Amino acid sequence: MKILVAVKQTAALEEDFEIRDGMDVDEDFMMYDLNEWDDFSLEEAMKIKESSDTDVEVVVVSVGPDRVDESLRKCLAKGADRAVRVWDDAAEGSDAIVVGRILTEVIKKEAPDMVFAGVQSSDQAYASTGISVASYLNWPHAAVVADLQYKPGDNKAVIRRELEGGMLQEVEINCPAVLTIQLGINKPRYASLRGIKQAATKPIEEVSLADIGLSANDVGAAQSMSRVRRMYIPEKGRATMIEGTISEQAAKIIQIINEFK
């Protein structure tokens, strides 16, 4: 049994980031971490390994350059068995549909029995990659899963998707399947200092595009389905700032509150 979890290291900007030139934010203002969704998704796989008296292989896989190793190391430390990073400089600027392709060819080698992805990423919030993987692979899918009922080897699986305004809907899905996991399906763990440590002895496995049958010609912004024309910061508001003390800022809120009763 094997669960492949696809993971993204996402960028957050610091306050007073700026722009190149035009076509992106300045490489300096970015801080990298593991996409928030992926915690829950990896947790979900470990939750499966944990609960079954049979052997289960959780492996994490990332398409990124090597600043990503640091996030993979964190997955390692939180229980994952093996970690694989796909990269070529060619791949730079690949949108979600290209990342779909690159992920697929890795997933074709690993041959896992289920694949998890994150509803979306926090930076690009595309909300498209995982399902795109589902497509090249031709596997059954579901996006936005709040609860999973699966036993390694089973061949159907009962998930619940999370709908607007609250409701959930159960859905029985055939496996192998892809699913994109939502926030809150579970409470992910923190690595222990022993985890951190043993993980520091593991290898992060390098895989290039040729190892999966792909070349310069299959990847990166040029073969994406959208071209950036330019980014810009939006003008942000017509709102009134209040400046001064607590006693004042708070005095103001209390005027407004009282203006309403």
């Binding site: 957050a12 900007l13 306050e15 980031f17 722009i19 934010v25 949108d95 979600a96 549909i97 926090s122 930076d123 595309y126 909300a127 498209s128 399902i131 795109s132 589902a134 497509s135 059954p140 899918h141 579901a142 936005v144 998707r161 999370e162 709908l163 607007e164 305004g165 609250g166 409701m167 959930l168 809907q169 159960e170 859905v171 899905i173 399947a177 926030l183 389905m225 959208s226 071209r227 950036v228 024309r229 980014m231 810009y232 910061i233 939006p234 942000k236 508001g237 009134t240 700032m241 209040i242 607590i246 006693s247 800022q249 708070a250 103001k252 809120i253 407004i256 509150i257 309403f260 009763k261």
Partner: protein, 314 residues
């Protein structure tokens, strides 16, 4: 030219965003000579033709599928076949939980131009240009689609205005492709207090820190006459019940005349549940937090000293 809209419905009600996309569509087409086809997909999909039959729709296609409600196999099949049979220049999906389950499938399988959660859309000349977010709505990314006979966009809900009035599409029927779906829908499931449809709200987000910190914003609220509410993280963690979540997946605080957002950054899905409140105060230490860009008043500051002192004057 055609613009293909795909509607959305669940458990027998047409979801409002449908009407928003027609809006989008209509405000987009370059010549009033261009048509706007709308499709609607489901085993009892007929029911909707009265409701779908409205200003802006030139053709209405009804697609009887295997299932009553959304199902990603059925949907990708149908929309593929409509795309083939209408050769739209542009097909518009609601960026919604259903769409997430298939839209990118479509785009992947042939060369379609593709872009999601788009909130500004326009032509420049013969050239379609779209705008969505970046770096967590810290920037706009304006994108185009060189080469692309056909472009598929998922549209943010509550951005585009629906049209006033009735109309007269030509109505048609197809069968969905015969598809033997690889998943099967089962039951819809719900998991007292108040219905946070109500006047005055104090709403805490991640900003607050730790479960122990809630009691004093619970107390703050008790003492202003406010109803305690929160962003998603608080409820995910189990610190307030899911009844008090504002947001795209919680409650929409319809009758809120006052909303103080404390330690909430303003994510897209939070705004969804509260963006229409008339007075929104935002308190937040991070001056570029998106919440500020729909508030009426903003304070930049720690929620903790704004708390006491408030709780002290009151």
């Amino acid at each position: 030219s055609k613009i293909l809209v795909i509607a959305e419905h669940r458990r027998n009600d047409l979801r409002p965003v449908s009407l928003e996309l027609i809006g989008a569509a209509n405000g987009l087409k370059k010549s009033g000579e261009d048509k706007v086809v709308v499709a609607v997909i489901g085993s009892q999909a007929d029911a909707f033709v009265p409701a779908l039959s409205v200003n802006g729709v030139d053709e209405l296609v009804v697609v009887k599928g295997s299932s009553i409600d959304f199902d990603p196999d059925v949907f990708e099949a149908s929309v593929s076949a409509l795309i083939a049979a209408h050769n739209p220049s542009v097909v518009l999906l609601p960026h919604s939980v259903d769409s997430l389950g298939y839209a990118s499938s479509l785009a992947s399988k042939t060369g379609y131009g593709f872009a999601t959660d788009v909130y500004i859309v326009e032509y420049q000349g013969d050239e379609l240009v779209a705008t969505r977010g970046g770096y967590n709505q810290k920037v706009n990314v304006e994108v185009d689609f060189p080469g692309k006979s056909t472009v598929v966009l998922t549209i943010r809900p509550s951005v585009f205005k629906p049209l006033e009035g009735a109309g007269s599409p030509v109505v048609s029927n197809v069968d969905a492709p015969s598809v033997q779906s690889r998943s099967q829908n089962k039951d819809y499931v719900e998991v007292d207090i108040d219905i946070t449809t109500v006047d005055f709200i104090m709403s805490i987000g991640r900003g607050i820190g730790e479960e122990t910190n809630v009691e004093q914003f619970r107390e703050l609220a008790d003492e202003a006459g406010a109803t305690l509410c929160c962003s998603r993280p608080i409820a995910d963690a189990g610190w307030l019940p899911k009844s008090r979540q504002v947001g795209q997946s919680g409650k929409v605080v319809g009758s809120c005349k006052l909303y103080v957002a404390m330690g909430i950054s303003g994510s897209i899905q939070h705004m969804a549940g509260m963006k229409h409140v008339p007075t929104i105060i935002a308190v937040n230490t991070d001056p570029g937090a998106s919440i500020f860009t729909i508030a009426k008043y903003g304070i930049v500051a720690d929620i903790f000293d704004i708390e006491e002192e408030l709780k002290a004057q009151l």
